[model samples]
Target chain A: TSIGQMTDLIHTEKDLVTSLKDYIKAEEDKLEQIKKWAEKLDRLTSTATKDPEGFVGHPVNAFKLMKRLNTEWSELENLVLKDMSDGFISNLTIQRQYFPNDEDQVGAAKALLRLQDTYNLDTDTISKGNLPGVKHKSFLTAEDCFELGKVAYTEADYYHTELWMEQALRQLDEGEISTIDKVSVLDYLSYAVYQQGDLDKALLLTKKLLELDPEHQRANGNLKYFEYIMAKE
Target chain B: SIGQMTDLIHTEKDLVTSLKDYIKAEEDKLEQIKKWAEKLDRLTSTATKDPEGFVGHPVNAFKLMKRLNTEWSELENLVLKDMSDGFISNLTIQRQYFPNDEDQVGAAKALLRLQDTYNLDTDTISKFLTAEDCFELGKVAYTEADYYHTELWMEQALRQLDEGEISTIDKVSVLDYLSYAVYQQGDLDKALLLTKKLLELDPEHQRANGNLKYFEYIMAKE
Candidate 1:
């Protein structure tokens, strides 16, 4: 019933949501006092902020003496809904509840299905968008991947640095990896895409990779190096 | 009155305590559900890896979901019991007895005597036990242990963060918990990935950037 209560709010009106956000922020600004902050923080003797900041964080540490009324004067509407939802989740569930044969293909298939459900995704939704000449997420040839690997290998020997990039590339070439692994494969392919003088494609691949793994290290490296070469007045 | 604002913090504190208490007591309930996970693992393993038998018992999967929903509903009520018309919220409303200044001081002395009975060592109410301080200290014993720690840490760091936009160097400290989570799980790569990701997100962010470099240097030696 409580989860139902939470789910009820999930699809509620946006205006009420915005109003709740403002209310919560105002309350959050006053959370310290309800939790008796002054005793611990001796210097904070004065309630400095003239106005009552209102009840905030210490709901975790607050006194449990209130009787909830129906009137809503709440904020943190998003966090409240989320916390209400999360309250339904177990803190600990045995491994089997979600995973049986943990690393098995059944687990993978189930994972795939769950992902599909949660993200409203299908195989097509996951793969690269159709363009006249692009499957860039996984468009790299083994030769292209390997050529990039050679450059990276020459440049560094850090921990597991090239291992994933190299193997991920090899997997693509050997068809050992799936189209699901397209973006990773493209990262390796970008190097060769450059060597082959397909500067335009290399640039596009770099752009796409940034869109996906914006924090990817070697992806960042390759882009920078490519830019330096491409730089001209 | 025995209550004004200082004596009124509740709800969340009680709910957090109730939560920890449930965690301690409900391990059995949780393990029962995990049983299906263990069984599912065995069934799936034989079917997928070794290929000796059946793929799954859809009935079992359905049962697992049923259990999950059941457990979920149970927790939902427990928390609602904490949040709804909950007594924790009642702690701060209008009070029955308004203590005169002298009565308030008497209340403090009486509490000090009672607390000393518990060896709380109030020896002499400190020179600093201002009128408000006395009321606040009475609540020192009421937090759930785990949440107490969360409250402490959150208070410290959140206060620092609240001090306004901290220098970039201090920003990565926010990711400390995520790194600790990854590291404790033995996913050093993931831990590094996160710190590096943090650095990438805000190049000047001090913690993730420094921690990422330090994480790599250590891995290099290892």
Candidate 2:
């Protein structure tokens, strides 16, 4: 009975992973479709708005515009609204108590950081999944690098934060798109660099961040402060 | 600009807003999906390390089955039946701001009235109109019981169809309307001929089949 239960559990876990992977893949595919549809609508609307009166004046054009807004757009909106990940999330939330606690997550992250120090592994190598003797390679996303940088940042580990955030910025430069805003990464990275006594690098990063988001309050303030300090130096 | 033209500009603005809202809602949904996937990836990877040990605990063992049998299936259904309730709800709220069926009909009629006011030839007025456009105008005229314009537009639609013009409206549809309009215009012989053409395209068309018999009987009696 013990062996039977254990084997069943293993099989269940394997199935869970398989199903979750498929779910993620499907979700990504759906999102990609929605993105394309949005782009098409964007192009159509941009052209129409240039001369709305001229565009809508033609009887056929006016009729089609109404059909599009009244009918076709409703269809597109319906497509955009379709989502299939609720069941997984709700189940995960219910069974969350059986999973690893927040402490486990923190410890796991710390363990990775410890391993990095012990092996003297560069962030790029570790992120690229090129760790020595590792058969299973997994690349970290730009957001992943940003999160790792934030973890180090919370501990006031400026050294590691600078390393990871720079890696994040590099990933963006390499055309890795992520939800992690470039400005946010620079906001963290610049401050981390400044804390590590690199005023010049920090000022440069702050200015770069401002270029992306001129209205970013902290970066704007940091720019002024950084310049004032540099001028005095 | 006239009031009507200014209103069209407002409609365009509303459409832009709708597009932007849908895009924003969709992106938010994708982000949530991504977050859930990443969380599960981490959880499953940890459990894979020592499955037996993980399941050794009674609660863990029970939860595993619940997740596998019930939870995962539920998730699968959720993902498969993906819905944007928020977007739909917002769209429903904004529906009042959008043009409706009445607006479409009114716009089509306005084009016809414009043609008459300008004393414009059909060709001059319909320079940009496709076969579908002609069909739509004919349908609008038919709805108003204005068989004069209906015959005019439907004939144009049939002519365009003969020219191999692409349209959402097919030859059968144009013939069906054209034949009925011709009948209403007291051209029974031509109506019968047009009905036969419709039957050739779509023999299974129920109305056309009935009309064919009726037209034949009327013609034989006359």
DockQ of each: 0.02, 0.19
i-RMSD of all predictions: 17.4, 8.3
- Local distance difference test scores for all models: 0.39, 0.71
> Taking the tens digit of each residue's C-alpha lDDT, what string does model 2 give over B129-176?
678778888889998998878888888877877878877777887888
Worst 10 residues of 1 chain A by lDDT: A64-73
- Error in Å for residue A129 of model 1: 23
Q: What are the clash counts of all predictions, listed in order?
A: 34, 12
Instruction: Provide the TM-score of chain A alone for each candidate, in the order shown.
Output: 0.25, 0.65
Fnat for candidate 1 (0 to 1): 0.01
Model 1 achieves a DockQ score of 0.02
Error at B11, model 1, angstroms? 7.9
TM-score of each: 0.20, 0.49
Please list, in the order the candidates appear, how each scores on TM-score for chain B only: 0.25, 0.57
